[PDB]
């Protein structure tokens, strides 16, 4: 079951800039001291990424059903573990298979079925009077499902249900892809001491799991958890708190990248070919060091704009006149041809 929210004052979404983020391993092989270029879906450097807010201090709660393009980039600077999980689907009305990825406090499961989703699935966390701990009870994410095919249970990740208003201490990135009906998840936990304007550091995302589902994904929604302490009356109409949280959502596009590998077989730097002529020169030479001289990268060609057809003045005409302006007409049994 689910309940509806009430109209309140929210904050419009803002736009930020990425800084060398969205790089993962494109293959499951080992390369040592190899400058290899591959064609795969990555996040472009210094690309313009959608930013959402989740901090209470007001009452910001914006989780729209964003469209799912070819590959997405999800980065969160989670500190108090407010984010819970993700869902996917096409129409979310129990007519097509839909994903349900929820990181619960006990175990992580991957169930992909026809769950009947409401307009805003969420998890409710209550503060007990006798017990000084945060516990989740409102499991309002769907109503029911009829049948499905795939199910999976991940490792029992330990979770903290306590929310604070302090500065962020950890950064988590997630990449979701769908090629050949194969679901790809890339993630890596990177600690950092920052709140905004993500650093220019480099961190390749290792693969996590390769779950086969083979359905269509075009929409997704983000699950958030709120708190109900003694200050709020406890009704989800106008009084609630959600702590401090923030998440970033990005979209991936196919680009050509040159990846640097070390003696450990780990990615260190990445160079594009369609961003900077200096970067194009670096990746065409298959080297990170460029000396002085003449270098040829690509070619330039002008495309035609219009298509004119100045046909001749000798255009003739058909004899539709004398066949219509005929003095004599034949009988029906002897009609002319």
């Amino acid at each position: 079951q689910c309940v509806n929210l009430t109209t309140r004052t929210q904050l419009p979404p803002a736009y930020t800039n990425s800084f060398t983020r969205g790089v993962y391993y494109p293959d499951k092989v080992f390369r040592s001291s190899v400058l290899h270029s591959t064609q795969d879906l990555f996040l472009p450097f210094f690309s313009n990424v959608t930013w959402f807010h989740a901090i209470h201090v007001t009452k910001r709660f914006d989780n729209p059903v964003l469209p799912f393009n070819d590959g997405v980039y999800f980065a969160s600077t989670e500190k108090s573990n407010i984010i819970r999980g993700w869902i996917f689907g096409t129409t979310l009305d129990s007519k097509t298979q839909s994903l349900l990825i929820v990181n619960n406090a006990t175990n992580v499961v991957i169930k992909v079925c026809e769950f009947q989703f409401c307009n805003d699935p969420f998890l409710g966390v209550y503060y007990h009077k006798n017990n000084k701990s945060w516990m989740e009870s409102e499991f309002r994410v769907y109503s029911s499902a009829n049948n499905c095919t795939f199910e999976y249970v991940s490792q029992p990740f330990l979770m903290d249900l306590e929310g604070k208003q302090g500065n962020f201490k950890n950064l988590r990135e997630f990449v979701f892809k769908n090629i050949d009906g194969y679901f790809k998840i890339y993630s890596k936990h990177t600690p950092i001491n920052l709140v905004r304007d993500l650093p220019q550091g480099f961190s390749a995302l290792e693969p996590l799991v390769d779950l086969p589902i083979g359905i269509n994904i075009t929409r997704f929604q983000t699950l958030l958890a709120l708190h109900r302490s003694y200050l709020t009356p406890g009704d989800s109409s106008s009084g609630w708190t959600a702590g401090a949280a923030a998440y970033y959502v990005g979209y991936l596009q196919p680009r050509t990248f040159l990846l640097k590998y070390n003696e450990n077989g780990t990615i260190t730097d990445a160079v594009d070919c369609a961003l900077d002529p200096l970067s194009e020169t670096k990746c065409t030479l298959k080297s990170f060091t460029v000396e002085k001289g003449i270098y040829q990268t690509s070619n330039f060609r002008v495309q035609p704009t219009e298509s004119i057809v100045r046909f001749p003045n000798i255009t003739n005409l058909c004899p539709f006149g004398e066949v219509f302006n005929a003095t004599r007409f034949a009988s029906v049994y002897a009609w002319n041809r």
């Binding site: 200096l278 460029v290 001289g293 270098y295 330039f300 001749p312």
Partner: protein
């Protein structure tokens, strides 16, 4: 379709050249002679000051006709032309080289013999 200065005999609609390419066609409705020329093509050449010296490059065009300097060897953009002449190290062509000279930016000049 440029305006030509050569007259065609009053029985021809096509026209070729020495290299056997249709580059002159008569428009039928008004009787004017128009030439056919390919729009533009070429390559994107770049000049580099080197490693541990600079970070900016300049785009050089082979024969495409157009900060921006109109050189004899095409179009060069991102390099400022200067009238004085020094010894050059990076050959470009047609009596003009390029070098990194004083901040400091990439410049183009006629080389000194």
């Amino acid at each position: 379709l440029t305006e030509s200065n050569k007259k065609f005999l009053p029985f021809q609609q096509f026209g070729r050249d020495i290299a056997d390419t249709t580059d002159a066609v008569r428009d039928p409705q008004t009787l004017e002679i128009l030439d056919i020329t390919p729009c533009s093509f070429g390559g994107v050449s770049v000049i580099t000051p080197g490693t541990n010296t600079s970070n900016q490059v300049a785009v050089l065009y082979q024969d495409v006709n157009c900060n921006v300097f109109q050189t004899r060897a095409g179009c060069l953009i991102g390099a400022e032309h200067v009238n004085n002449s020094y010894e050059c190290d990076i050959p470009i062509g047609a009596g003009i080289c390029a070098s990194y000279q004083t901040s400091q930016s990439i410049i183009a000049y006629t080389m000194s013999l």
